[PDB]
Amino acid sequence: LNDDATFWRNARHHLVRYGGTFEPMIIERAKGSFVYDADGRAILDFTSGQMSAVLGHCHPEIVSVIGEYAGKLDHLFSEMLSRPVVDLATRLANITPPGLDRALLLSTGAESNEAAIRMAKLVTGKYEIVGFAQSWHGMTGAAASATYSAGRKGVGPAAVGSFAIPAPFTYRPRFERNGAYDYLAELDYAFDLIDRQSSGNLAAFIAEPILSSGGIIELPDGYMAALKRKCEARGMLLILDEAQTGVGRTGTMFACQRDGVTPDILTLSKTLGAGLPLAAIVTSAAIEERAHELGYLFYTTHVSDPLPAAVGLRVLDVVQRDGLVARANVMGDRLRRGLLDLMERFDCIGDVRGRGLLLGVEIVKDRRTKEPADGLGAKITRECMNLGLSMNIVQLPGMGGVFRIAPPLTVSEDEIDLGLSLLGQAIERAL
Amino acid sequence: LNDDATFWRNARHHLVRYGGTFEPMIIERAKGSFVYDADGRAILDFTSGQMSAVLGHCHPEIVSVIGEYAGKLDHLFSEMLSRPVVDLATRLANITPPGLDRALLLSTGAESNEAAIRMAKLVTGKYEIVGFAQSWHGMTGAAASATYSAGRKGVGPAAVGSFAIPAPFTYRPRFERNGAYDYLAELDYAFDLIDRQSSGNLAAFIAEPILSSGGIIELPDGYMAALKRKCEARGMLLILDEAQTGVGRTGTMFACQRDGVTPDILTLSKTLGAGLPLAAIVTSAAIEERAHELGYLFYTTHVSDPLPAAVGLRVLDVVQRDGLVARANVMGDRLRRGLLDLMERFDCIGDVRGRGLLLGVEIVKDRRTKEPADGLGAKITRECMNLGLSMNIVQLPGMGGVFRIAPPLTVSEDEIDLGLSLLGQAIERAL
Amino acid sequence: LNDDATFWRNARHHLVRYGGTFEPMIIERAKGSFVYDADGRAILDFTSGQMSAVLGHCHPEIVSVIGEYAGKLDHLFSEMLSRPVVDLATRLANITPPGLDRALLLSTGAESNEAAIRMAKLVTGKYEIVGFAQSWHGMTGAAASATYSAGRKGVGPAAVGSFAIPAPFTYRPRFERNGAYDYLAELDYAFDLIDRQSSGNLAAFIAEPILSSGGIIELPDGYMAALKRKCEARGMLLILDEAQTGVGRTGTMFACQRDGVTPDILTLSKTLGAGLPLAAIVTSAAIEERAHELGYLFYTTHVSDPLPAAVGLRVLDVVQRDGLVARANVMGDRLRRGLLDLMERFDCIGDVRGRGLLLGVEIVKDRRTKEPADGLGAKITRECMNLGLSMNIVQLPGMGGVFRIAPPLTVSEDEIDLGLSLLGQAIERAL
Amino acid sequence: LNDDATFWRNARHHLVRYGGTFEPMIIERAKGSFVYDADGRAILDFTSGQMSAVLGHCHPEIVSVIGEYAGKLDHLFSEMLSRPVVDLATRLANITPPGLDRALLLSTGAESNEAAIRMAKLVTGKYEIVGFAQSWHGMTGAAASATYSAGRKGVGPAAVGSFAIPAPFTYRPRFERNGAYDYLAELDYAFDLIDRQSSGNLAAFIAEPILSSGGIIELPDGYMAALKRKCEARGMLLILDEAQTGVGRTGTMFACQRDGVTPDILTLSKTLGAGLPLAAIVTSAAIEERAHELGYLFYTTHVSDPLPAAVGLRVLDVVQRDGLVARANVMGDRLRRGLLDLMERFDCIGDVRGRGLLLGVEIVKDRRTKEPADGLGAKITRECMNLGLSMNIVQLPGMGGVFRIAPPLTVSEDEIDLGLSLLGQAIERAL
């Protein structure tokens, strides 16, 4: 059982609480698209752990490689090179778009974002950063200064030069030009305001291709491209945060690949390490070169460690080989359809959005009003869990709560169906 | 060979440079107190990788556990608990001093420091942070704002409310009270200045028990304790950064254990993960409780992931079981003695300092003057490498460069001797 | 003549340049609505000096009082009270709206704004300030941090916590709700963005009732009132900057009197000192009381100096007695009509706006396009000067340049006509 | 009488309290070295109003000039030049040292300091400012960020990049080098710390030649000069704040004249306007030129207003003509001697310091201990007042309270004697 008093006792005595609430169970094992509690109950992992496990849990390939390096080459002095590093770095230059030539291998997403940010600041010699008002980039310093979906309060001033502008949001639009949502005019209007506040030290814009924590918000048609133009015009880098969208989750190796818009720095992590702590940034040779001339420094314990590098390489391998970017499209499409059927069935479902296997479902109380349904989302979620489906809903000011659905790229069709089912039941049972 | 042109070519085309210079070799394997290049040359790892591998490389225990969890329980949604987490958290409450009750399990040292810092800020409701002027806490946001040994330049304003005061440094003292180094009066004098600059929002003081990157600078007798008193008097937390001093490196599980001075938050990482990416903070139940009331948030992909948790637990186990804190004292003492013999032999050796197996050697040009010997340090280092001993020297304004010597806690006596020897030769050959 | 080489020589050798360009003449005397050059040429002062002389130049009443105190009571230790101070302070409590009870007497407008701002910060215990994106509050610290019409660049970071939102601008509207300019919805939309960026430390909103330097932009119907509501809802003070709108310039003693919306702090200066250096802030007894409890401090050399206090009292007197707030309405109305006739005559005149004797004229190249007419404004201005009429045009990104017309409240009708004429000619001659 | 209830009533209802406490009297007139209450009691003004009236109160010369311009040329558009301006600007280039060529004419001391500071920032392109830990520069933005004697608390973050270092203080020394106060080594030591905290954006150092509000602290022999060297070495401007030391108060036109060390920008105000609101900054032609190239802007209502300019010119005149810088030396010396006699008489007098007519008297409880005498200072002061001598004591952490004695440069010998007497009595009567 899940009731080990000792377990819960220590848990209560010795854990720092760091947000949300602990799931009332004890996970004892995980494999593929499931986790198993202490009763051996199998739980369908519709979020791939914390939105990371694209290969699923305990992937035999990973398990293989992990072992190899653990026993062969684990960790080294940060000034020593090894093959996994150069290989992974090289693979990355290779699978990313053109213009992305050199990589730096780290440990976390926020870390990856801090590296990028520091780099833009170094090469521009400026420090003002602009993000979206519903963004998430990490808990640390700079990444946190640019995160607006949450965390801004009660912990001192943000970094000097922090700005946000609204994310283009088709589902809940607020900028009309001629009786229609002109999100491109919204962008302009936001930028002028920014331009008016700047001290003249705009260094970069950071953006998630699809805002996840922000409620699965997809940058609409040509926005990304217009955005790059705002940056270029201002002598700013555009940094694309692909912690969750990267590595084939949206059914392209990299989301930025869909818009055909290549950023100045691309950051990776969650899906790169597929559950393990490995991250990276990728920049142009020109940018890398100037950073270097200017003395760029981003030296850590784990930068360039062989074991993690090895793990990411294997992940990229397996993804490539097992043709998982496409599987994300197939399954995603299988899932969307189901979500849309449910939506047919249930009025509380106000929106089915997202891409590939990064889908979002927006719970509303009234389709015409899109009145957020209060408590309803929490219910569905509670219910999914009982029914044995791990889910995640995010709730920001102004919108219905959103289910963030992101199963493993390796998920099966039945697993999808199974999931779609538990969900159907959870909603039925929650109304 | 180490000349694989392809290797070096890609390395040149695809790596972002992030500080220092790449060692001209290709590390192909590592085991125990050695790394091996592409020729199979065995290199004596006198820094335990990047000052992390207390168990040495590829420790069979680690290799065991790594495998287990990789294939059993890897990564989970951050709201799900599992045993390694609670166990490690519990172990930590247990082996740390009194007053340290609850832990948070993360991925990196800077991450660990950011968590701590944010926590102090949350509970004090203030934001000014004070560190030592030769500190190192990480590359990220807040950790970087409090790092003064380097990195402050060319990357925008530091965080609002950043201060430093000089570290008590016996080897090179600058505050005299009655014809003697009154480092305790220095502390007072520094604090008054701080008090005069504060906006009245002093939240914490952060400190390394022994400044490593800063040149193996040990806080002298009663300083730590006086320091805690400065904090207490100001309503500030004292955060102790034990990324490298922790986990028995200085011959106590935790350096703060030596002074009998327990901090408000203790951070751990490097030696905790023993090469793997795992970190932690530990605080009092009272502090944890208030943080929680105030909504403390520090939510990451890898917080509470079972695999890393598992790895740290095993590390603590093995350290305990194999009685490595003591081995650090034995070996350390074996090494110090040798360093002191060399010092007898060579005048360029102006100082042998540090504790346990965290020793520092300060290169000078003249003992009477303690004139830093220019280029000499770099030479010795170059030479050690040829002789097959990996070394690390750090150089700050005002001092001779310092060798940071920190072999694995598992190192053998011959390995020590061997090392002491290569060093003797490197110096001979460098003069 | 105006060519005194010596004069111009020294002027060139010994003056720090501080913006704009020096008028090529030498002002030798001033009286009423004119200044006279070194040739004795009379220049019609359509801006009342630097938008200050509501009584005109060298007002006999002022000249009287100035003398009195100069020879009777000039300057005192800031802890000594005298009658002019208490009288003026009292007069102010008396003529200002309800809710405004206590005054602080200073020297400059920026000074007045800094006092207010510091006060809001003290009583809220917060520090984030929000202004309009085309505002002007002064050159100093905080006033400059909240000034967005200009000056933000090349002089370091602005104050921590600085924000702006767009000013409601009917002439050039950019926020449409249902095929119309919903400036009230714009306000909401701006505030949400602000709310999303705040660290949770919103202390105040500062605003000019009519943006002058910003291009004579009048807050439209009910905006001010909605704004106050944004502040109230957020626990923020609303500070109204009436440096130029105050003291009857807009045909009400205080512009805020028109909307029937009373701010938490009101600041005064330009028109208060009527050319002399005297300023003030006025707050509620409740606010004053709390500031005091919290130790409010704003101690200067000239706070509470009798001479200036005396001068302002006399100004208020004379304004009252000579019924100048009304004269501002009469003359203003006389002037608007003329401006509108010109507008009839000339297409380059795209807008006649403002209130009382604070009128603005927006030069455009095409009425349909409202394309700013480039160089045209500068011409008209040059021409006015030749014709003997001192004018002022302000030019911000996105708009035609604007003439800021603000003659003395004491101006005569013929003087108005005269002015309207020189202008008619200047435009004719500039096309 | 001083009891006008109405007076006190309104005073209570309508005055914002802004620091300290109101003197319980009603000043009705002032002339020469006295102010007179409502009973006609004559009070000996030992602080020249708020340390401003070098000509004394209601100086007939001033009264003359004030009238002239009031009725002739008062205030103008900031782009119009007139003779008083150019004349005063020229006079200033003339009486100041070499290297000081161009002036900017403003209204207040803080204003003057903000102009200077902004200028340094513009020309260095940097923003970090360093001052003394017991400084006073003004209540506004930047001036307040650099003021450390008080005001730092409860009003938000200071400006980004604010630093202080300790002022060299012979009376109460805390840095010993070889059994002696090495204040020059203190300076070095402070600067290294600063160097370690800087983001590499040191723009200027600001300093009062003698810290007044800070307790009449005179920069010792060669310090100023060493300081200039710190700045030069760092590419920083040295800005000298001479609000009170300037204009012959210390018995040199400008205190910096004594050390033969000329700053990059010199600011003036208090004694320049001799009670009226007029200030100025003076810089080198080279600096002015570069500021200008870079677009320097510091545009105010009262910059370059003829009336105030006129008043300062007259002040400089009269000072020159009436040979008041020397009178400051004579009288000062007359006063010091008396203070030293008192000191002979009373043990509570621990220190007689200062220069010219800017003397300070430090009250202590024990000469050997220099234990600040608590309440004693306040007593003496209370007593002086009863005896009819207006005095001012300032009290900072760590020192006895200090009387700041600064009578008019025009003061007479008997007036000095008279003062020395009331003081003798006040102390007698306070013990």
Ligand SMILES: Cc1ncc(COP(=O)(O)O)c(/C=N/C2(P(=O)(O)O)CCCC2)c1O
């Ligand atoms: C006290 C402390 N706290 C946090 C950190 C940072 O942890 P991490 O960079 O992994 O986040 C470190 C990192 N130490 C070094 P080092 O091992 O060579 O001394 C990593 C490369 C240069 C600094 C550290 O000493």
Ligand SMILES: Cc1ncc(COP(=O)(O)O)c(/C=N/C2(P(=O)(O)O)CCCC2)c1O
């Ligand atoms: C775009 C992006 N960048 C960096 C990060 C941070 O990476 P990390 O916290 O590991 O440093 C994240 C983290 N995402 C979450 P999520 O998976 O539930 O959305 C981690 C828990 C709450 C935010 C992220 O989405």
Ligand SMILES: Cc1ncc(COP(=O)(O)O)c(/C=N/C2(P(=O)(O)O)CCCC2)c1O
């Ligand atoms: C060196 C310096 N610079 C600027 C200023 C500020 O000028 P102002 O406040 O008029 O702007 C001052 C003000 N001095 C006092 P003081 O005369 O009692 O010492 C004004 C009341 C308390 C501080 C000053 O000493």
Ligand SMILES: Cc1ncc(COP(=O)(O)O)c(/C=N/C2(P(=O)(O)O)CCCC2)c1O
């Ligand atoms: C609303 C407001 N608040 C404070 C101030 C500043 O007061 P001051 O500069 O005297 O401190 C001003 C100054 N206005 C001008 P203007 O008269 O030409 O518009 C001074 C020259 C350019 C800006 C102002 O409009």
Ligand SMILES: [K+]
């Ligand atoms: K490494």
Ligand SMILES: [K+]
């Ligand atoms: K996790």
Ligand SMILES: [K+]
């Ligand atoms: K005063």
Ligand SMILES: [K+]
């Ligand atoms: K002017």
Ligand code: NA
């Ligand atoms: Na590429």
Ligand code: NA
């Ligand atoms: Na413990």
Ligand code: NA
């Ligand atoms: Na009123």
Ligand code: NA
């Ligand atoms: Na000169």
